[PDB]
Amino acid sequence: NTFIFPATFMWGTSTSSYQIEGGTDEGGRTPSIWDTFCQIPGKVIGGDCGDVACDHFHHFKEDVQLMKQLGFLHYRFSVAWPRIMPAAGIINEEGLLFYEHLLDEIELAGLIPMLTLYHWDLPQWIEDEGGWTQRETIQHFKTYASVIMDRFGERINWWNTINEPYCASILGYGTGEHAPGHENWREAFTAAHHILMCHGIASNLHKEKGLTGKIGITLNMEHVDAASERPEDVAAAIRRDGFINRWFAEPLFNGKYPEDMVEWYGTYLNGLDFVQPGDMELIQQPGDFLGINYYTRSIIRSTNDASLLQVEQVHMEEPVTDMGWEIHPESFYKLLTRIEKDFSKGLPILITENGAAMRDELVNGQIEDTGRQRYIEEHLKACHRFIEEGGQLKGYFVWSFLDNFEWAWGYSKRFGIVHINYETQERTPKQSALWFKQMMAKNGF
């Protein structure tokens, strides 16, 4: 019962600019879609916003240091587009300088970075122009991806293009639940096609510059089980699987959308009119690795309701996070397995986000987060059984170095291995972070 991981296995943590940085009106930065969205009554638990957050804008030196001391080799962060492109075609030099310095600190501690170009903080001025439902957005993206790549990239070992196109498009324009908060399936599907092109856009800029860094997109995926053996339930689960995974995984690897999904969406796709000649080829570029974010599985059953997919998530109460999310590590094994067979057929796979939000309690200045630790460990064994069976898992970034703006959940949800005290801003590593330090040292509990 030992779990030793490969020699070269990549151990990191991740964050995201809007969720940790704060300094929203500082340093030339202008409002993102989330600064607006967060203000709409009822959209984010408690009214919470990304103002201040963990204030990583001023604390960046100690955070990257706390990583070093926690025995991390890799750090995955994102760049806040609004810090870089605060208005149309301007290039804010003070914003580039924050990341440059952040990168100085990174290399000073001897850490290896991964920069995510897009992690959901679209500059509002772009949403004003139409947001992700306009092709022109892609040109703006180009502008933004070009600056970051000239300014860095002799320096960046790992490029991550889009984080989770599913959330920014589907939840962003479709269900309303993420910024900017639209409820329009036509837009959602239009936006998903544009964001997926930006991965391509950025993949082209990367080769035209001849950079040596690895590059890849990140999809959030979810394993999907039918609720019962009834056929309409089996059908239901096929639809959920197409809706999160195949709609985004298919174009990237095979240059097409899932036909059953295209048939199901029908009128909302307006005959794929948003697809110009050459787009799908632009999209279909798996690059150097597949980034995956995984948290839980869905148990799906069919309904005959008014929703796009006509599906119901059966709400499992068995081991769950503070988010109602079920801990089912076996399913992380079955998802990794399926990703290799379809789509990724030998390309390196990186888990760019994996973690859990449990209720925390400070006790004698320590955090006994046995749930979070239990959850990480279990999924790491699921990650282990997949390696050994010939799985191309090369890396694993624990989601969230720090407790942070947990989107629509606000600050009510804590995913950090390092506890943030929002009254004083002081960082305090939790028992799980101490566990992760011993684990990377022995390279495998």
Ligand X SMILES: OC[C@H]1O[C@@H](O[C@H]2[C@H](O)[C@@H](O)[C@H](O[C@H]3[C@H](O)[C@@H](O)[C@H](O[C@H]4[C@H](O)[C@@H](O)[C@H](O)O[C@@H]4CO)O[C@@H]3CO)O[C@@H]2CO)[C@H](O)[C@@H](O)[C@@H]1O
Residues that bind ligand X (CB under 6 A): 164, 167, 171, 175, 177, 220, 293, 298, 307, 311-313, 353, 399, 406-409, 415
Are 290 and 217 in contact by the 8 Å Cβ rule? The answer is yes
Nearest residue to 243 via CA among 177, 314, 192 = 192
Shortest distance (Å) from residue 221 CB to ligand X = 9
Whichever of 149 and 170 has its CB closer to ligand X, that residue is 170
| Whether 229 is catalytic | no
Whichever of 155 and 334 has its CB closer to ligand X, that residue is 334
Nearest residue to 148 via CA among 97, 207, 96, 204 = 96
- DSSP line for 389-445: TT--EEEEEEE-SB----GGGGGG----SEEE-TTT--EEE-HHHHHHHHHHHTT--
Shortest distance (Å) from residue 348 CB to ligand X = 21
Whichever of 293 and 432 has its CB closer to ligand X, that residue is 293
Are 216 and 290 in contact by the 8 Å Cβ rule? The answer is yes
Shortest distance (Å) from residue 50 CB to ligand X = 13
Whichever of 109 and 323 has its CB closer to ligand X, that residue is 323
Cα 140 from Cα 9, distance rounded (Å): 36
Q: Which residues contact 179 (CB under 8 A, 6 or more apart)?
A: 32, 33, 34, 36, 37, 38, 120, 122, 172
Q: How many residues are present in the chain?
A: 445
Shortest distance (Å) from residue 202 CB to ligand X = 19
Shortest distance (Å) from residue 90 CB to ligand X = 29
Are 6 and 373 in contact by the 8 Å Cβ rule? The answer is no
Structure tokens at 208: 């035209």
| Whether 326 is catalytic | no
Buried-exposed string 394-413: b where 16+ CB fall within 10 A, e elsewhere: bbbbbbbbbbbbbbbbbbeb
Structure tokens at 207: 């080769």
Shortest distance (Å) from residue 220 CB to ligand X = 4
Whichever of 167 and 367 has its CB closer to ligand X, that residue is 167
Per 3-state DSSP, what percentage of the chain is helix, strand, and coil (rounded to 5)? Answer: 45, 15, 40
Are 250 and 256 in contact by the 8 Å Cβ rule? The answer is yes
Q: What is the dihedral of CA 429, 430, 435, 441, to 10 degrees?
A: 0
Shortest distance (Å) from residue 353 CB to ligand X = 5
Helix axis angle for 136-151 and 93-109, nearest 10°, is 50
Q: φ and ψ at 198, to 5 degrees?
A: -65, -30
Whichever of 92 and 296 has its CB closer to ligand X, that residue is 296
Number of C-beta neighbours around residue 370 at 10 A: 12
Left if phi > 0, otherwise alpha if psi is -120 to 50, otherwise beta: which for 401? Answer: alpha
Whichever of 48 and 104 has its CB closer to ligand X, that residue is 48
For ligand X, the nearest residue by Cβ is 313
Catalytically annotated residue among 105, 127, 164, 250: 164
Whichever of 305 and 361 has its CB closer to ligand X, that residue is 305
Catalytically annotated residue among 105, 127, 340, 353: 353
Are 398 and 414 in contact by the 8 Å Cβ rule? The answer is no
Shortest distance (Å) from residue 28 CB to ligand X = 27
Catalytic residue annotation: 164, 353
